[PDB]
Automatic annotation (TrEMBL), chain A:
NCBIfam families per record: PRK01827.1-3, thym_sym
Keyword line: Methyltransferase, Multifunctional enzyme, NADP, Nucleotide biosynthesis, Nucleotide-binding, One-carbon metabolism, Oxidoreductase, Transferase
Gene designation per UniProt: DHFR-TS
Phylogenetic classification of the source organism: Eukaryota, Sar, Alveolata, Apicomplexa, Aconoidasida
First and last residue of the signal peptide: none
Reaction(s) catalysed by this chain's protein: dUMP + (6R)-5,10-methylene-5,6,7,8-tetrahydrofolate = 7,8-dihydrofolate + dTMP; (6S)-5,6,7,8-tetrahydrofolate + NADP(+) = 7,8-dihydrofolate + NADPH + H(+)
Entry function: Bifunctional enzyme. Involved in de novo dTMP biosynthesis. Key enzyme in folate metabolism. Catalyzes an essential reaction for de novo glycine and purine synthesis, DNA precursor synthesis, and for the conversion of dUMP to dTMP.
Organism (species): Plasmodium falciparum
The keyword Transferase is assigned to this record: yes
GO cellular component, one term: mitochondrion
Domain of life: Eukaryota
Residue positions of the active site: C422
GO MF annotation terms: dihydrofolate reductase activity; nucleotide binding; thymidylate synthase activity
Protein name as catalogued: Bifunctional dihydrofolate reductase-thymidylate synthase
Residues the entry annotates as binding dUMP: R277, R402, R403, Q441, R442, S443, D445, N453, H483, Y485
Keyword NADP annotated: yes
Length: 536, 537
């Protein structure tokens, strides 16, 4: 029998918040949360100058109506008020917000404007809008109007006013993933009182990434669907129902990190229980694909903390053609340490191999495929097939070749390697000045390996694109044996109930024109916002 | 404004049909159409003995009701008759069909049973059933009962007259893809009166494949729906007309696994990039697809055109023997490798010192001898190089949970010595619960011509490897790198995409063959292949 006001009059908040310039004390231990994005305004303007995409979203959300849904809404409203029963939306804003607009775009096209202003007078109005001087007076004005929905579009004070009074049903919130000077700030959203229910794809507009989330207020010929039921006539790990409460609560999960997370979910829900070489046990499945649009974001996972110095150094080490594990160890990159011990090599039957002499692994295959391996210190210059050089020449001079592959699975050399490669091969595709990369991965440790693997090959696709005068397009990651280790299950449960942030961007020094000239200083990850580190 | 009787009272048909024993004069080149599946009954019983899955579907469809939707139906029916004011479905059958049901299943459970008869009346039945002696009395009865939907469940005579009288809104039609003795038949459906709107996944049950299709009678407080619209705020190419894919796009549900292939073609046609390529023909192309075929349920031989497998089987056996001699295939009248072995082709690869049809260290050589020095096609390479094929077989048997069971043809060292570099780059195997899956990664994929054969090749191989390792085949998973449609294939493929698939065939292997090397051409049989007309691409 009971109903809320915001439910009856369909009152929503729509906003856009950036990150704010702070004082950098303890930035090595900087914590991020939803409040990280709170920057509304500066000098009576937006902290950013123009965002074409957030603008387009603003318009499309505040101007969209469905006239065939109105009859339901009008009935409820007139029945609530105890009254008898082109359509537009209402846009409520503060005075400062109304002032800071061009003359050409006032009043806001296809929308019913409402300005909350004490000082202003209705009679000396040049324009044709409505005016109120109280929050109480809005509900009055809505009762006397035919409107689809009512959007609170601005003013820090306005937002704050409506939020305290529980007059907002949903918050449409653009996260602008860049830092600007700010005068005014969106209030801290209470987690008990609102929850996120949907998250969009990640985009780039005007030199920043952004995404769109929706907070919802908490409370604590359409008969051919029978044919769909008939198709499901034949359908019906040890997982619990509430292990994935937050994960399953979301309606729309369009953020590209859900490609990784959904795969985890699928293995956890439907994986096959297996022993493996390690003796730890896994849940596994066979055959997935993920795709990341490198034109829009750098897909560094945000649901836990990832570090990249090590994987960049590894990549540079691959590109030099190195097999000497000591090079990495002397830079405190320990990714290959365990695979180079006396004991590990002996268990591989490599009894005559020096410690950290990893054998003819990735780097050797990329630069010297087919050369005879001796030891890690030998001179292999101009020996074997320099695959790396050949793919770069192919991309430059025969971009429509279907033969642009870099393969590390050298069958003849597998037993000489400290271990056989996981990243079997890379294929490249060029169209309209744009480079995409498929990497096939025979064995995928989803909890610990895959997050790094995505980052490495995404960085590498940038590197190859740049030195070939191309823009990066897609990194396409194909998983063969995809497995969650049992000792990662509880960490991943925690991770899957976290909501991703808009991704970072990768910056390469643009002076680097040849694949072999990159050094560690040439890589910058910007605007990395992430949840707390998890140890698997 | 005038309403149809079948629409008001929601009258449907539901049947299962098999194929029927016909003349042996033209079986080498048989013609197939929807009327291929027309076998209803034999000597008062089903032509096939039992089919658990068809019975389960029959049960599911004829018992399902949605109580929420009834209020609208009651209103609609009440309105038609000019009246103001657990739920079950009605099933209507012929007398003969009633008597074919065993006593313990009569009357049909959780359904209102109705029986058409002239020779028998209420007094002749002990059971809770309505008897009617004419079709019009069904309609009168439906006006009086509260029910969800009404399913005509056969009799050959009952189906025939109900279709003749235009009282069927949809036909739920099981295609049983095997042949049995029949004496009663489903009537030939008029293509002008009914069109297929949905095709299901393909299944195996009781030693036959089957699927389920739906013919439709032709015309001759929780709302986040707006949030979905918002997320779509940023949205929009190769001289494509709408009518090109009229049939393809008319279907509501395209769950038949053949649509994995057809949908990729569609996607390339609509959204592919125009590019030149090595051939000069040019292509539409896209990068990165995955298809999955369940080999436990069907053999995925494409049905929207005709394909023969003798060549590709001979090729696979040639691969397994480790051969590189093109003449061996030519002497079996298989010409798959003929163009790649001519003097002119070898010279154009700069293989001036290679004998005609000496293909160099291609697939077979890499499978049995990776890393060995290629000399010529007649050399004895025994115990040279890495016998990958034997290694994977040993790994599958002895270390099934290994994540290292890969066969790789892309030997970077040898590429230039190959008549041409391999397209099917590697196979990775996976073993769980006594069942074998295979991923194949294909770097370059000719959608019109190559891919249909490649699916078949690696599906066969998966079965061979499974058999010799005492496992059952599960999934063949096909990963496409550079996926292209050739420009000269476009019109042919537009034709193909407006054909509706048939239930897939099955592949049988000689169970005596226990070693990968012991297979011969006669150890393989394709059964129950129903296909559209061959298309010359
Ligand atoms: N999504 C976004 O990022 C977004 C959207 C819009 C604007 N902005 C930015 O934010 C800044 C403006 O925000 P702001 O909060 O400082 O200005 P504002 O809220 O737009 O304007 C404040 C004025 O609104 C009136 N008002 C507020 N609460 C009221 C109440 N309860 N009753 C009656 N009147 C009330 C008063 O007008 P009187 O002076 O008439 O009393 C008050 O001085 C600008 O820099 C603008 O560019 C950002
Ligand atoms: N594969 C399938 O989908 C399927 C489904 C159902 C049945 N079947 C098979 O089909 C066969 C039976 O088919 P059938 O054509 O021989 O018989 P049927 O159509 O079930 O029954 C015909 C009988 O029903 C009565 N009947 C039909 N129309 C009537 C009307 N307008 N008014 C009064 N009575 C009417 C007559 O009964 P009286 O003789 O009493 O007058 C007639 O002899 C069996 O082999 C059965 O196993 C197959
Ligand atoms: C777009 C920011 C914004 N974004 C979201 N998701 N929610 C909001 N409430 C919001 O705030 C609207 C407050 C209105 O503020 C503006 C800004 C830009 C403009 C302008 C401008 N300065 N110049 C041009 N040419 N066009 C326009 C669009 C007419 C006008 C009003
Ligand atoms: C199933 C074939 C069938 N399949 C489809 N798609 N449509 C039909 N109209 C149809 O025909 C039904 C008319 C024939 O009805 C029956 C009843 C019961 C049975 C039986 C049986 N003979 N034996 C057992 N054990 N169980 C059952 C089901 C408890 C078989 C056929
Ligand atoms: O870059 C890498 C390297 C290794 N692994 C994982 C996959 C397996 O969990 C393990 C290697 O084991 P084998 O598949 O080789 O048994 O390391 C990755 O996920 N990514
Ligand atoms: O099993 C095969 C063999 C070849 N091709 C096609 C793909 C390409 O169109 C062509 C090989 O040309 P390149 O990709 O090597 O350019 O042959 C296949 O689709 N499948």
């Amino acid at each position: 029998m009971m109903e809320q006001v915001c439910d009856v009059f369909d009152i929503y908040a729509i906003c856009a918040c950036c990150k704010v310039e702070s004082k950098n004390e303890g930035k090595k231990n900087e914590v991020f949360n939803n409040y990280t994005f709170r920057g509304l305004g500066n000098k009576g303007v937006l902290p950013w100058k123009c965002n074409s995409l957030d603008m387009k979203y603003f318009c499309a959300v505040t101007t969209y109506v469905n006239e065939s849904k109105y009859e339901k809404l009008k009935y409820k409203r007139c029945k609530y008020l105890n009254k008898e029963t082109k359509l537009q939306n209402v846009v409520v804003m503060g005075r400062t917000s109304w002032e800071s607009i061009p003359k050409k775009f006032k009043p806001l096209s296809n929308r019913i404007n409402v300005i909350l202003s004490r000082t202003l007078k209705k009679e000396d109005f040049d324009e044709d809008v409505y005016i109120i001087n109280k929050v109480e007076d809005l509900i009055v004005l809505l009762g006397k109007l035919n409107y689809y929905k009512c959007f609170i579009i601005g003013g820090s004070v306005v937002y704050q006013e409506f939020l305290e009074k529980k007059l907002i049903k949903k918050i449409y919130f653009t996260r602008i993933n860049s830092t600007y000077e700010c005068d005014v700030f969106f209030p801290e959203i209470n987690e008990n009182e609102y929850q996120i229910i949907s998250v969009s794809d990640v985009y780039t507009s005007n030199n920043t990434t952004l995404d769109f989330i929706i907070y919802k207020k908490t409370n604590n010929d359409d008969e051919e669907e029978d044919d769909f039921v008939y198709f499901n006539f034949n359908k019906e790990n040890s997982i619990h129902p509430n292990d994935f409460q937050i994960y399953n609560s979301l309606k729309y999960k369009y953020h590209p990190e859900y490609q990784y997370l959904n795969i985890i979910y699928d293995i956890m829900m439907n994986g096959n229980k297996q022993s493996d070489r390690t003796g730890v046990g896994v849940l596994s499945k066979f055959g997935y694909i993920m795709k990341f649009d490198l034109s829009q974001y750098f897909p560094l996972l945000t649901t836990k903390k990832l570090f990249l110095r090590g994987i960049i150094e590894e990549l540079l080490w691959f590109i030099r053609g190195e097999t000497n594990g000591n090079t990495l160890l002397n830079k405190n990159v320990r990714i290959w340490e365990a695979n180079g011990t006396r004991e590990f090599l002996d268990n591989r039957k490599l009894f005559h191999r020096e410690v950290n002499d990893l054998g003819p692994i990735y780097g050797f295959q990329w630069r010297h495929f087919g050369a005879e391996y001796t030891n890690m210190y030998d001179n292999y210059e101009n020996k074997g097939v320099d695959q790396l050089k050949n793919i770069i020449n192919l991309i430059k001079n025969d971009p429509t070749s279907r033969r642009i592959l870099l393969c590390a699975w050298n069958v003849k050399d597998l037993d000489q390697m400290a271990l056989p490669p996981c990243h079997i091969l890379c294929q490249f595709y060029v169209f309209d000045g744009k480079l995409s990369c498929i990497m096939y991965q025979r064995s995928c440790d989803l909890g610990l390996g895959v997050p790094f693997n995505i980052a490495s090959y995404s960085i590498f696709t940038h590197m190859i694109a740049q030195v070939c005068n191309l823009q990066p397009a897609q990194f396409i990651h194909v998983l063969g044996n995809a497995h969650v280790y049992n000792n990662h299950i509880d960490s991943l449960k925690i991770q899957l109930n976290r909501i991703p942030y808009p991704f970072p961007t990768l910056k390469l020094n643009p002076d680097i024109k040849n694949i072999e000239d990159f050094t560690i200083s040439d890589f910058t990850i910007q605007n990395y916002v992430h949840h707390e580190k998890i140890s698997m």
